[PDB]
Enzyme design. Structure first.
Site, mmCIF file in Angstrom:
data_model
loop_
_atom_site.group_PDB
_atom_site.id
_atom_site.type_symbol
_atom_site.label_atom_id
_atom_site.label_comp_id
_atom_site.label_asym_id
_atom_site.label_seq_id
_atom_site.Cartn_x
_atom_site.Cartn_y
_atom_site.Cartn_z
ATOM 1 N N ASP B 65 2.554 -1.692 -17.392
ATOM 2 C CA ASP B 65 1.568 -0.755 -16.918
ATOM 3 C C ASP B 65 0.220 -1.562 -16.728
ATOM 4 O O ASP B 65 -0.406 -2.039 -17.721
ATOM 5 C CB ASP B 65 1.402 0.326 -18.010
ATOM 6 C CG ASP B 65 0.395 1.385 -17.653
ATOM 7 O OD1 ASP B 65 -0.095 1.427 -16.498
ATOM 8 O OD2 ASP B 65 0.060 2.212 -18.555
ATOM 9 N N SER B 142 -4.942 -5.281 2.247
ATOM 10 C CA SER B 142 -4.682 -4.312 3.300
ATOM 11 C C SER B 142 -5.792 -4.514 4.331
ATOM 12 O O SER B 142 -6.807 -5.132 4.064
ATOM 13 C CB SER B 142 -4.736 -2.884 2.731
ATOM 14 O OG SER B 142 -5.010 -1.930 3.747
ATOM 15 N N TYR B 155 -9.204 4.801 -1.233
ATOM 16 C CA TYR B 155 -8.270 3.669 -1.023
ATOM 17 C C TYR B 155 -8.980 2.419 -0.463
ATOM 18 O O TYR B 155 -8.762 1.242 -0.936
ATOM 19 C CB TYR B 155 -7.171 4.124 -0.010
ATOM 20 C CG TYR B 155 -6.218 3.020 0.374
ATOM 21 C CD1 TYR B 155 -5.186 2.648 -0.472
ATOM 22 C CD2 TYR B 155 -6.403 2.336 1.506
ATOM 23 C CE1 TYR B 155 -4.350 1.552 -0.157
ATOM 24 C CE2 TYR B 155 -5.537 1.324 1.905
ATOM 25 C CZ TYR B 155 -4.519 0.933 1.066
ATOM 26 O OH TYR B 155 -3.704 -0.135 1.436
ATOM 27 N N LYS B 159 -9.358 -1.383 -1.948
ATOM 28 C CA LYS B 159 -8.992 -2.497 -1.131
ATOM 29 C C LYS B 159 -10.113 -3.524 -0.753
ATOM 30 O O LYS B 159 -9.894 -4.677 -0.907
ATOM 31 C CB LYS B 159 -8.029 -2.096 -0.001
ATOM 32 C CG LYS B 159 -6.609 -1.544 -0.446
ATOM 33 C CD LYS B 159 -5.945 -2.379 -1.479
ATOM 34 C CE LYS B 159 -4.508 -2.084 -1.743
ATOM 35 N NZ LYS B 159 -3.608 -3.248 -1.845
#
Ligand code: E2B
Ligand code: E2B
Lengths: 284, 284
Positions: B65, B142, B155, B159
């Site tokens: 984790d 990304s 997000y 990123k």
């Protein structure tokens, strides 16, 4: 009637100098809520308020912890006029040191305050701005959110995140009439890199000797850059006023053109190799 | 003897296809630890392992984790060879929707896993790589960490943060012989945007009608972009192999050249106005 302005992080620096600058304004156009995490730190805001002789009623302080959405709501509640015309997200934390020397809590806290807390402001305040079809959001950015610096890994992580957050929002907000702008600061002379770093003693504990030595070299170079490039918070504050006054704000305002060469080289070698090379030699 | 590779997030997608690709390798050069948050999700990793007939002993799974540094330590302990030659940080969370519709926990979690968890890997593993004077770190990036997208605010925030984190590190690591590279992915066809978004019902609850309508338009356009641009995880995995094999890795590998025009326009209008304009019309 008056332009209502709520600013986060006013106990020092850019936020303090902007709150009372607007204060303040010979024109008396602005009603300012200056927010702070701890009210015990509000002395300088009220000193400086006296120095620039802000009128009575120009400046209300609120307590606001950006890590706590109930606190963001309670400060929003206390905005009597029932709208915010200019939201300024400026509260921020620093963190400086070898990555393995940073406590995991300290890593978590910078992200919480610098990214999540900006998210919490925008969640609490953007809905009503979109309904009204008007509103300015200004966000304190850094040139460390536009290019990475050794030993600023987490700070830059946080600053880069704000670019990601705000650019994504701006693409949506364009046809709403809500304006978001980053004010991208170079070094600012306030009181900055203070207890953003542990003792040499504690940092050496947590890292190798070679990394430790490199940290010193980065610090020497940083001191030099600051002494040759660092701007006034008064100078920085005019840039916020320029953005707030513009009939059609762009996404980014630069308070200095000085790093734009360096940023050009990041951006025309997409592999990142030129930047990393140039910066390695610049710093070391 | 064998190159020891530890990858995070192997239960699906890029991480799963890379773990067994390396597996796998007709040459048998690679010993892979494939880590996953929940072992109950390890079925596909072992299916695919059978399909590409990985040899016995090529692939060990570990539970890990990334939000939990004790778990990062316990997975590091279980690396019998006592070194990691290639660390791959790939575990990641998505989040899609109007900003005010995202739960504050969900915002906190994406940052925790995508940024803080990468920090935790690097803290646990970088020290010994620097001592050895060798090691490759590959990080799943990304194109959403290079330019902001409407409804991807958080997000993209996450990123972008990885760019900040990794670029800052690379500037320091250059003379250590430890190599860090981002593998910058466009749309990848795996299983991605799944329960990264609430029901239309719940999203409408949390936002205005006009914002809600715009979300649908962004989704329509995203579906189109994916259907016209989305790459294989097999194709993506070769890019990781290219970086891992390079005698002197650059900071960034692009798995597609397709967005590089768009990124050029961000980067030669520093005000962000061209990008935001182009993207607004591209999406809407
Ligand atoms: C990133 C930066 C602009 C670029 C500068 C630069 C440029 C070129 C160069 O070669 C060296 C250097 C070193 C100094 C760099 C500055 C550091 C400063 C940020 C900072 C750090 C820690 C805590 C706080 C806080 N309390 O908020 C603030 C400012 O934002
Ligand atoms: C950002 C992106 C590359 C650029 C794309 C683009 C480019 C141009 C354009 O005009 C539109 C669009 C829309 C789609 C965009 C992609 C979305 C995808 C990321 C994503 C999102 C939520 C969860 C996950 C996850 N589970 O990991 C992953 C990919 O990384």
């Amino acid at each position: 009637a008056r332009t209502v302005v709520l600013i986060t992080g006013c106990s020092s620096g850019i936020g303090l100098h902007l709150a009372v600058r607007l204060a303040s304004d010979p024109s008396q156009s602005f009603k300012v809520y200056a927010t702070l995490r701890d009210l015990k730190t509000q002395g300088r805001l009220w000193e400086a308020a006296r120095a620039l002789a802000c009128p009575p009623g120009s400046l209300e302080t609120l307590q606001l912890d950006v890590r706590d959405s109930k606190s963001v709501a309670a400060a929003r509640e206390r905005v009597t006029e029932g709208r915010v015309d200019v939201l300024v997200c400026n509260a921020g934390l620093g963190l400086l040191g070898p990555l393995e020397a940073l406590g995991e809590d300290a890593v978590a806290s910078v992200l919480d305050v610098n990214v999540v807390g900006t998210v919490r402001m925008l969640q609490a305040f953007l809905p009503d701005m979109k309904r009204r079809g008007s509103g300015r959001v200004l966000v304190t950015g850094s040139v460390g959110g536009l290019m990475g610096l050794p030993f600023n890994d987490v700070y830059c992580a946080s600053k880069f995140a704000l670019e990601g957050l705000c650019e994504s929002l701006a693409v949506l907000l364009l046809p709403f009439g809500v304006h978001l702008s980053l004010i991208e600061c170079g070094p600012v002379h306030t009181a900055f890199m203070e207890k953003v770093l542990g003792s040499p003693e504690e940092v050496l504990d947590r890292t190798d000797i070679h990394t430790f030595h490199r940290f010193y070299q980065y610090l020497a170079h940083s001191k030099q850059v600051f002494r040759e490039a660092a701007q006034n918070p008064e100078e920085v504050a005019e840039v916020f006023l320029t953005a707030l006054r513009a009939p059609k704000p762009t996404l980014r305002y630069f308070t200095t053109e000085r790093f734009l060469p360096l940023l050009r080289m990041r951006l025309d070698d997409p592999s990142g190799s030129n930047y990393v090379t140039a910066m390695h030699r610049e710093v070391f």
